[PDB]
Amino acid sequence: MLSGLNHLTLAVSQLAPSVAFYQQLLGMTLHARWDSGAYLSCGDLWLCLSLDPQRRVTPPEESDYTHYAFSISEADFASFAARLEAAGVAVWKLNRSEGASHYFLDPDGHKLELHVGSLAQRLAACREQPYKGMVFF
Amino acid sequence: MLSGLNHLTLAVSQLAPSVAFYQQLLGMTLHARWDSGAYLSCGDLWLCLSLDPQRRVTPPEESDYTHYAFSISEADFASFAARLEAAGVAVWKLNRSEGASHYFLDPDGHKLELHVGSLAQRLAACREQPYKGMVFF
Numbered sequence: 166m167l168s169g170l171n172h173l174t175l176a177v178s179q180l181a182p183s184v185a186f187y188q189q190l191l192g193m194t195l196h197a198r199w200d201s202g203a204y205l206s207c208g209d210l211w212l213c214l215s216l217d218p219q220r221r222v223t224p225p226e227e228s229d230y231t232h233y234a235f236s237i238s239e240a241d242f243a244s245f246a247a248r249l250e251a252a253g254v255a256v257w258k259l260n261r262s263e264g265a266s267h268y269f270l271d272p273d274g275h276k277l278e279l280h281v282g283s284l285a286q287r288l289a290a291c292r293e294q295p296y297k298g299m300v301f302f
Numbered sequence: 303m304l305s306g307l308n309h310l311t312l313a314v315s316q317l318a319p320s321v322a323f324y325q326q327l328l329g330m331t332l333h334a335r336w337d338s339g340a341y342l343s344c345g346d347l348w349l350c351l352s353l354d355p356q357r358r359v360t361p362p363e364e365s366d367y368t369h370y371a372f373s374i375s376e377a378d379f380a381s382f383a384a385r386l387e388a389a390g391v392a393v394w395k396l397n398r399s400e401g402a403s404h405y406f407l408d409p410d411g412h413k414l415e416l417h418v419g420s421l422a423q424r425l426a427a428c429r430e431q432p433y434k435g436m437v438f439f
């Protein structure tokens with residue numbers, strides 16, 4: 166039986182700027198670094214950056230909607246978004262759903278998000294205003 | 303600050319086969335579906351499958367090393383991996399370069415992994431068998 170997400174691994178084209186992005190800009194904790202990768206944590210999340218020459222710096226129009234959302238409190242959301250904007254981090258989408266969301270790109274074009282709100286909150290909102298074809302289990 | 307992974311969203315090309323893969327084959331909990339997506343949980347992980355006409359079925363030699371690992375216990379690991387193998391689930395990696403892991407593909411080629419062990423356990427193992435150039439902070 167699967168018990169949760171064990172780790173998220175992102176392929177990166179250049180290790181130093183990716184470590185800087187996740188550790189310094191996004192505030193994650195750096196636990197280890199080697200010639201071809203790094204391990205960081207963000208709360209319970211184990212993040213691995215893996216240096217991969219096959220990683221392309223990918224414009225957002227050229228990747229699908231796969232994306233990785235990080236939790237932040239409502240109280241901290243706007244100042245963290247402003248930090249990303251000061252650093253020149255590109256946005257790939259505007260929020261049109263429930264719960265605050267800021268959609269931003271990492272140096273290689275990985276699609277990231279800051280989101281406020283849980284699955285339970287989303288399900289409650291959907292129960293009140295179901296999407297087209299929505300079924301609950 | 304950022305406190306963990308709020309959710310993982312995977313773009314999928316065909317919704318019902320992907321829901322079946324994550325719910326039936328991997329055992330995750332299905333909470334809701336709609337015409338363009340589904341919400342599942344795996345322990346504390348919120349997984350969203352998003353129907354995306356841009357998603358392509360991607361062979362593993364065509365994608366980089368970005369991947370998603372799910373936690374499984376030492377007692378359950380081998381029989382779960384063997385069940386995926388017997389079910390014909392495609393693979394993408396054989397060499398255990400980060401501990402006890404089984405590497406397999408979802409229907410669209412998303413790179414998945416079963417892994418036994420925490421970040422702390424992986425750091426302890428790496429102190430004895432470090433990756434080249436490894437430094438610990």
Ligand SMILES: O=S(=O)(NCc1ccco1)c1ccccc1F
Nearest residue numbers: 300318319321322325326332335
């Ligand atoms: O809309 S459903 O009830 N979704 C639930 C589902 C899909 C895969 C696993 O659970 C459905 C769609 C298509 C075929 C069968 C169905 F049960």
Ligand SMILES: [Br-]
Nearest residue numbers: 317318321335
């Ligand atoms: Br469905």
Ligand SMILES: [Mn+2]
Nearest residue numbers: 232234278311
């Ligand atoms: Mn999202």
Ligand SMILES: [Mn+2]
Nearest residue numbers: 174371400415
């Ligand atoms: Mn892994």
